[PDB]
Amino acid sequence: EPEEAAALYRGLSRQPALSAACLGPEVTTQYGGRYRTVHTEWTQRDLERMENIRFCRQYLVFHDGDSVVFAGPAGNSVETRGELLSRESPSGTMKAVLRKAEKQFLEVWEKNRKLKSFNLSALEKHGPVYEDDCFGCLSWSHSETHLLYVADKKRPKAESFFQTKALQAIKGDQFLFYEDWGENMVSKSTPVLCVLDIESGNISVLEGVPESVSPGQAFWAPGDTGVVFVGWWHEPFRLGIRFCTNRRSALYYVDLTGGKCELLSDESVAVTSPRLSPDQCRIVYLRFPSLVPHQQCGQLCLYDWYTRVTSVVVDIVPRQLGEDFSGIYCSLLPLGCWSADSQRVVFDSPQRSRQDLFAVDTQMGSVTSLTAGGSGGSWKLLTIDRDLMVVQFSTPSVPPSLKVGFLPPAGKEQAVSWVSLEEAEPFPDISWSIRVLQPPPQQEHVQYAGLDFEAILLQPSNSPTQVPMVVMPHGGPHSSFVTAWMLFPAMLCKMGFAVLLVNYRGSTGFGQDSILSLPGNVGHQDVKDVQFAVEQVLQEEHFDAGRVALMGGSHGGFLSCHLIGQYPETYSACVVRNPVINIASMMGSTDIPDWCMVEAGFSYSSDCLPDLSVWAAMLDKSPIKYAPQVKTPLLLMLGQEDRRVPFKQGMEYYRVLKARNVPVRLLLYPKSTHALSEVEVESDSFMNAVLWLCTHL
Amino acid sequence: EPEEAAALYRGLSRQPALSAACLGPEVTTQYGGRYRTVHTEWTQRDLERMENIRFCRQYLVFHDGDSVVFAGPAGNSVETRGELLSRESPSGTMKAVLRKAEKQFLEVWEKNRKLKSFNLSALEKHGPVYEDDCFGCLSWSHSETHLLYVADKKRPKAESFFQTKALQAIKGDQFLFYEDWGENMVSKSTPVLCVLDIESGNISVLEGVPESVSPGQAFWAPGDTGVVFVGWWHEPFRLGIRFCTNRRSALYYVDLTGGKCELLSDESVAVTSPRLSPDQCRIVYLRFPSLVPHQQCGQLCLYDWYTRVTSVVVDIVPRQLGEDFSGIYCSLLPLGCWSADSQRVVFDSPQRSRQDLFAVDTQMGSVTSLTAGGSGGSWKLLTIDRDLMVVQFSTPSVPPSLKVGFLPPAGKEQAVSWVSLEEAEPFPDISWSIRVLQPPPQQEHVQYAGLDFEAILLQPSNSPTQVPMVVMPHGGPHSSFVTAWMLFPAMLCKMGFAVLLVNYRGSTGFGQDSILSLPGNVGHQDVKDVQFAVEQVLQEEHFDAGRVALMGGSHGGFLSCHLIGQYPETYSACVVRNPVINIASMMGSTDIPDWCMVEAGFSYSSDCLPDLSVWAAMLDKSPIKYAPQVKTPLLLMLGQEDRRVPFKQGMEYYRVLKARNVPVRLLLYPKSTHALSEVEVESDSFMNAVLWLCTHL
Amino acid sequence: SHGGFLSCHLIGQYPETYSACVVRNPVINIASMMGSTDIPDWCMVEAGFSYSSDCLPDLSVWAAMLDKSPIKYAPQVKTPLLLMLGQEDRRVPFKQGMEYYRVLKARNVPVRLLLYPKSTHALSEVEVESDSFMNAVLWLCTHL
Amino acid sequence: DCFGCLSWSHSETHLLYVADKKRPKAESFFQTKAL
């Protein structure tokens, strides 16, 4: 019944999520106690006004130098609006904010006064500011006198030929084509570094950057003598940048005065996420050697500012290093990741089906797991300052909660003590577990033999008893599910279903061999893995084999279609979001053409031409080949403005199915682009999916 | 030079102002220390975006029960937007907010979640919510299950005769006239009490209110058995309500269920600002006996809820009670004004030219001054909870600052200790003093003999030396200047001028005799008082008698025009804002017609008719009579949408002066109504005034 | 349209005869165009096969379609080119021109591209039509 | 010019034309209703 589903959706979506945190300066009282403040940003979904609202909250922590004595709240929640970026000064006395209230303003606050405000639009020195997580940045000087950020390059003015003038500007150039960076990057062509002087108020665009690189993720060099940034190559043409770490880039340093850029790394592989040590003597960054896959295991590299020597701290892990580490599969290090002594780095990464926090000693090279053991969970580090770590913890049956802790001395990280700041009420209805699956001998290649995969099973606890099941493979194909808080699986579990999330071979967190085993075999290996997992779960758990449903999006939807074509007597429903149907036709219309070439089994090369062999191979691997066998009812959700997967892919499948009189229902959202992240769109899609599954099962 | 003036205006206007404060619940730590949080709201002027911005800040206070041990900040400032009203729950665990984000929403917050949100517009049970300080309110139940507020009454739907219908609503009634409440109250005709249930979400409009009274300022009765409110009479027609305490009203109580209103006071005089004691056994309110003047000295009345007995705590003060008290001249008591034991009431009031805090013991009746002595200043109480007072302090040479303190036991209030929370940097350039003036024997009436008045003198310290002077009389005529932070006088002092603010006989804070001495003598008494003050100051201080200027608004412009007409060889410039020129023509076009009748010397009665004597008396007292003698250059600023003083008053004077070829400059703002409170309008007017004065002097 | 198809074929097969070329919403790759246009039967009829609903991609049909497209001759183009495209086109999707533009630019050939975000297929808006005609005339005069 | 038309009757009392078909009204699940 729709009413119960709507009430349940309201109740479940009433849970907030944490997004950021920063620490304030230390304070000493006359009595002797020492305390400091913690700032946190939360986001929530409001259905009445249909929007994502953000608020800021503050907490107080009393410590004794190496132990947390007390922790409490410090007021109520305040809702903000129009905040794009913010950054506290190194000394914690001023705050810089970017606000879009439309024009963009830069604001400097101190104590209970807005010290200064600049209208960037009026100055007319650049375009809109980059507020994303790929190029955007906002950095202070060590002297706290200048600000550094990135903004779109300025375009020359143009006008039409037949424009009257009162009784300069290029004529006929107002419709030139400027290439952007792909999905969710519309109108973002070429960024530039901008330096602003707080005292006077003069903005300057740095000169010296190479003419064929887009700069980003910059910070001031030691001594405020220059700027260090990461340059992405955009020649001969731009490729997709979202969720893709295999884009050529390098690390550069340029002086404030006019000069020549200096190279600090190798200009043949991918690099990203540089961080400067507290003592201003070394840098650490992430390096990805190969450009074939869009997501892989990376290396941690160290660079010494004075000796100019580069070394490798953490290398590639083929299968498993020890029994607690599997490699670095993240793409961004925390803004604060250095310990006080400037000898250790703390980060987080996926291990198997969970997410853990690790500490690395840049001197020796050992990696220690802080959250090893237990039943599992999802940890996320938000910041570390003077050996005080702030983290978020969540599980499939417990919404996010906040915690703080002190990093123990060297050689004792396995004894960290956590103190709760904000806790969430668990749901005792949901029970979750992990299943390990070993592929049968036939479905194994000689090159990589002995690999296994996993699945996460969610079921209603305390059941009387045949139960229906819903199976979800993830997108990617280089991604994975972690034992964190997920809304829709929780709703399905609370509505009476049993959810099975599959992590097939080729997912992140299982080693480099699993990553490299998939490419070239898409279409038969992962599909058979999912089928084997479903068969084993059905045989063991003793569920209701007559009621099984599928659900997936993007590549997962791809997989979903294949299943309902190859095993048409196993599933009784299917829901898909922006699926991939025909690779051959998709190659010439997407923003990441190398994806199709890599997945099919060939090598991407600029100035490629359509060959018969390549097209035949691509067509042989597409689910459309099995269309005349589909028999299960289908629900399709498409976003018209999608740029990663064009929406005609679903239209071809819809036409093919409808021509044969098969029950198919289609929904098209004219504005949603790829993720259907708008509150209204997401709510409507989820409600439709739940209603469809309940009606058919 | 305009550039220096603009820079000085920026620097001076960069100062924020405090507007509210509330206290959080008490917290106890394991060690034993006790602390609590303080919430403050600040407002500031931003010239880049030309708007008044509001932010919220929080502080931490550690105490020991009767002494403040420590006080510190608790984070940064957060800018809000769209907040109309807010109110913390009695237990300090939830917060209710009204937001205009256009529709209006009611939000309930708890911890780090927006617990609930209601869209009042969709429910369609009333009109826009009253967010002003005359009728608006937002109250919680003692059980914390219901909310009470006030909203506009619902109007029946209407439609035109020639309206097509698809192939109920009164026809021809869409242009009926609904009378509003006057200045700054456009579209506010008839409020109604609304009660909302948080659990379910059903709104109800209370029934039982008299058909001829507008209700407001309501709160829940003890035991949540009903509602207590103040009803203003709006028959036969409405009069102005802004800055007017002589409007007939009474105090009513009505049960939640359908019933008859019960009267709790006398329905012949003015009443306002009721407050309920912490123990829920008594109420205290302000009563104004007479309706003649728009501002006068009031009485403090006490009502016992169980014995149903009314008594007078603080009565009228003719001239002076002791040497530290002069009467209650305020119009609103603080939301929290009761001491913990429910025996004492703390408020603030103007004493002479300063503002002080007083404590009254409702048992005996004694009044004690907490801030007696010293050189002077301006104090403002914001809230008291469990004997913890939060106050604002300011002076003419020191912007506002915040302080907290503990109320001492009974009989020891003269030993309060203040602790600073936010302090402001003083300006050592400005020096201020107070002058006392005794009128000469001729300018005294037999009825009130022996009265005197005062002036505030601001001059640049450390001057080499003849100095120009600017003279300012206040509006009202029942108001006064207090030694607080004022922007424009500070700017004039810092630009080289000497400012003289006059408090002539008839101002508030000098007793009831001074209040009653003015009415009927407007035109010759106050003008002569100002002239005498100027003469005495010039003779004593040895200023530059050749350069003296005038500045005033409203009644101030009235006095300025009288001065420049009757004494045309004393002033060399004049600037006026929305002045009063002709009372006879103003009577029939303003929203407070009783003002003219009272000031002229007659009694106001509804259904009055124009008599020759009244019109002759009104014309004899107007500055226009002296127009053919004016010789000083004049600057006029007018607001077209003014409803208190129609803007044709200035136009008549402008035409009369221009017809004789006198230097006159006029500025008209199409949108500003009476106070020119818009940031752009205020800045432009102030800059024009300063430039005019500098150019002519 | 089809005129651009023929023009690209001409400038590819005979690269020593023409000194300039201007095209509006051309057809470049029939195989990729089949699954994205509003008249799929056009490609089937022109290629030489019969159109039938519920059709499936066969190797022979795709090979025949690819053999007849001007893209095959891209690595021989030598003449300067001007492209005008309408983003909201539904008869000929605008990626057809983008593929040719990328192929030509990868080899450092003088190419100029104009994209109109709103014009659909005919560029019938007065501003769009005037701008396109002026650009074409200026290009031809400059190169010839 | 493909479907549009506007025709008179021979008696000049009626008019005939063509217009888009009417669609049923729809609303979201989380839509508030008047109380």
Numbering used by the authors:
A (entry chain C), B (entry chain A): 9 to 109, 117 to 182, 199 to 495, 498 to 730
C (entry chain B): 587 to 730
D (entry chain B): 148 to 182
Give verbatim excerpts from the published study on this entry.
Acylpeptide hydrolase (APEH) or acylaminoacyl‐peptidase (AAP) is a serine hydrolase that regulates protein metabolism. It can also bind to and process unusual substrates, acting as a detoxifier. The most prominent physiological function of APEH is the removal of N‐acetylated amino acids from the N‐terminus of oligopeptides and proteins (Perrier et al., 2005) thereby exerting crucial control over the proteasomal degradation of damaged and misfolded proteins (Adibekian et al., 2011; Hoernstein et al., 2023; Hwang et al., 2010; Palmieri et al., 2011; Sandomenico et al., 2021; Shimizu et al., 2003; Shimizu et al., 2004; Tangri et al., 2021). The S9 serine protease subfamily, the so‐called oligopeptidases, employs a further, size‐based selection process (Kobayashi & Smith, 1987). Their active site is sequestered in an inner pocket that is formed between the catalytic hydrolase domain and a propeller domain that caps it.
The pAPEH—dimethoxy‐phosphate (DMP) complex was created by adding dichlorvos (DDVP), an organophosphate insecticide, to pAPEH. The structure of the complex was determined by cryo‐EM to 2.65 Å maximal resolution, in D2 symmetry. Dimethoxy‐phosphate (DMP) residue of dichlorvos is bound covalently to the active Ser587 (Oγ‐P1) of APEH. The free oxygen of the phosphate (P1‐O1 moiety) is fixed and oriented by the oxyanion site. Here—in contrast to the pAPEH‐AcAMHK complex—one H‐bond is actually formed with the oxyanion‐loop (with the amide NH of Gly509), while the other interaction partner (the amide NH of His588) is still too far for a strong association. Compared to ligand‐free pAPEH, the shift of the oxyanion‐ and the His‐loops can be seen: the oxyanion‐loop moves closer to the inhibitor with the backbone N and Cα of Gly509 shifting by 0.6 and 0.7 Å, respectively, in similar way to that seen in the pAPEH‐AcAMHK complex, however, the catalytic His‐loop moved in the opposite direction (by 0.8 Å measured between His707(Cα)s), shifting away from the catalytic center. We found DMP bound in a non‐aged form—meaning that it retains both of its methoxy substituents. Aging is the spontaneous dealkylation process that often occurs in organophosphates bound to serine proteases, where the gradual loss of the O‐alkyl (or N‐alkyl) groups increases the irreversibly bound nature of the complex. On the other hand, surprisingly, through this very same sensitivity toward the OPs, APEH has also become a potential target for cognitive enhancing drugs promoting synaptic plasticity and learning in young brains (García‐Rojo et al., 2017; Sandoval et al., 2012).
